[PDB]
Write an enzyme that holds these catalytic residues in place. Sequence first.
Site, PDB file in Angstrom:
ATOM      1  N   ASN A  38      39.248  16.153  -9.714  1.00  0.00           N
ATOM      2  CA  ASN A  38      39.434  14.804  -9.183  1.00  0.00           C
ATOM      3  C   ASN A  38      39.157  13.748 -10.257  1.00  0.00           C
ATOM      4  O   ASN A  38      38.132  13.883 -10.917  1.00  0.00           O
ATOM      5  CB  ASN A  38      38.453  14.596  -8.005  1.00  0.00           C
ATOM      6  CG  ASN A  38      38.767  13.393  -7.155  1.00  0.00           C
ATOM      7  OD1 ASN A  38      39.918  12.977  -7.045  1.00  0.00           O
ATOM      8  ND2 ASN A  38      37.745  12.865  -6.481  1.00  0.00           N
ATOM      9  N   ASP A 103      35.450  20.715 -12.859  1.00  0.00           N
ATOM     10  CA  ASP A 103      35.268  19.916 -11.639  1.00  0.00           C
ATOM     11  C   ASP A 103      35.842  20.678 -10.439  1.00  0.00           C
ATOM     12  O   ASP A 103      35.539  21.868 -10.305  1.00  0.00           O
ATOM     13  CB  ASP A 103      35.924  18.564 -11.724  1.00  0.00           C
ATOM     14  CG  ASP A 103      35.558  17.623 -10.591  1.00  0.00           C
ATOM     15  OD1 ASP A 103      34.324  17.284 -10.518  1.00  0.00           O
ATOM     16  OD2 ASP A 103      36.518  17.151  -9.895  1.00  0.00           O
ATOM     17  N   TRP A 104      36.647  20.056  -9.558  1.00  0.00           N
ATOM     18  CA  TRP A 104      37.133  20.832  -8.413  1.00  0.00           C
ATOM     19  C   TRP A 104      38.062  21.971  -8.863  1.00  0.00           C
ATOM     20  O   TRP A 104      38.194  22.949  -8.108  1.00  0.00           O
ATOM     21  CB  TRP A 104      37.797  19.896  -7.391  1.00  0.00           C
ATOM     22  CG  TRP A 104      36.747  19.168  -6.624  1.00  0.00           C
ATOM     23  CD1 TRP A 104      36.324  17.848  -6.747  1.00  0.00           C
ATOM     24  CD2 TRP A 104      35.915  19.744  -5.591  1.00  0.00           C
ATOM     25  NE1 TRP A 104      35.319  17.602  -5.849  1.00  0.00           N
ATOM     26  CE2 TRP A 104      35.022  18.731  -5.139  1.00  0.00           C
ATOM     27  CE3 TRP A 104      35.849  21.050  -5.021  1.00  0.00           C
ATOM     28  CZ2 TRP A 104      34.088  18.981  -4.150  1.00  0.00           C
ATOM     29  CZ3 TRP A 104      34.881  21.294  -4.075  1.00  0.00           C
ATOM     30  CH2 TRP A 104      34.022  20.267  -3.637  1.00  0.00           C
ATOM     31  N   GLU A 127      31.687  21.098 -17.157  1.00  0.00           N
ATOM     32  CA  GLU A 127      31.437  20.111 -16.102  1.00  0.00           C
ATOM     33  C   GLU A 127      31.939  20.671 -14.761  1.00  0.00           C
ATOM     34  O   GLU A 127      32.695  20.053 -14.018  1.00  0.00           O
ATOM     35  CB  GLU A 127      32.026  18.761 -16.477  1.00  0.00           C
ATOM     36  CG  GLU A 127      31.034  17.960 -17.408  1.00  0.00           C
ATOM     37  CD  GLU A 127      29.865  17.397 -16.607  1.00  0.00           C
ATOM     38  OE1 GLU A 127      30.036  16.836 -15.538  1.00  0.00           O
ATOM     39  OE2 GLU A 127      28.694  17.559 -17.137  1.00  0.00           O
ATOM     40  N   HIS A 269      31.594  13.222 -17.851  1.00  0.00           N
ATOM     41  CA  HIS A 269      32.255  14.244 -16.978  1.00  0.00           C
ATOM     42  C   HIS A 269      33.606  14.683 -17.520  1.00  0.00           C
ATOM     43  O   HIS A 269      33.826  15.920 -17.542  1.00  0.00           O
ATOM     44  CB  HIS A 269      32.377  13.695 -15.556  1.00  0.00           C
ATOM     45  CG  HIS A 269      32.922  14.706 -14.610  1.00  0.00           C
ATOM     46  ND1 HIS A 269      32.300  15.899 -14.285  1.00  0.00           N
ATOM     47  CD2 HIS A 269      34.083  14.666 -13.884  1.00  0.00           C
ATOM     48  CE1 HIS A 269      33.141  16.550 -13.420  1.00  0.00           C
ATOM     49  NE2 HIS A 269      34.171  15.855 -13.157  1.00  0.00           N
TER      50      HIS A 269
HETATM   51 CL   LIG Z   1      34.699  14.435  -6.483  1.00  0.00          CL
END
Ligand SMILES: [Cl-]
Length: 290
Positions: A38, A103-104, A127, A269
Amino acid sequence: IGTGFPFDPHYVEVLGERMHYVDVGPRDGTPVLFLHGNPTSSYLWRNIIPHVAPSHRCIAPDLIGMGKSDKPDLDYFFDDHVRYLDAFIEALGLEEVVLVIHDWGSALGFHWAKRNPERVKGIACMEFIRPIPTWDEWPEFARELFQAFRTADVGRELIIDQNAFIEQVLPKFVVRPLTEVEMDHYREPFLKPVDREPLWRFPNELPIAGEPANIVALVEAYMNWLHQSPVPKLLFWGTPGVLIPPAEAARLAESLPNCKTVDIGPGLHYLQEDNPDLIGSEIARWLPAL
Ligand SMILES: [Cl-]
């Protein structure tokens, strides 16, 4: 650092919907599958893929609802993304893969690896998502904003109406300044507010303080798997990080088997925007021994 996206578009039908993906590099070996999170797309990998494509096939999908992929009239829960990515992988006929995840995309990739362990030959990660026990483990510089994202009404006003995940979170989580051209690439899929649903659902799925319980349990399951797995791992981290601070990257260097760490320098990030060349070069150097 390059701002262009010089990749031929590909589309495959997945569960009735079209998903966009990059597909470059030689087609006779183990492909390298790059999974964004995201609010990004395959554009996040643009400067990393050219380091890897001389040697290996690179496949980088846009998650459903994101990038150049179709936008069905979904709530965009994590489990929706699971279904579409699972079907994407099968639609391309992939067997064994190397994962490169963030991340996702990391929650998707680790969950896929746990369920398909004999098909994952290596995991490069950065991350990535672990359970977050309390808000104290979230960086103070983004605590109130992500608490608001998860507050009824307030979070949708920020993310849907004000486009905060694009306009606020991206610059906040890149150390260097992003250019207008880069920002406009990231804005392109979300020009219409209604299309921002996935951007809002994702922070409301994060496993924080035990909720939502379903996500906490699936993340705990893939982390248990990863801590036990002999698969080669390559972990990139920066200072001060967001999900993975330096001290945690140092602990993971021990608590994940057969793990190699890479310090990218300053990073928050979206580490790919701060040091793409070291991320791509180190992935390229690590692939042959897999
Ligand atoms: Cl998020």
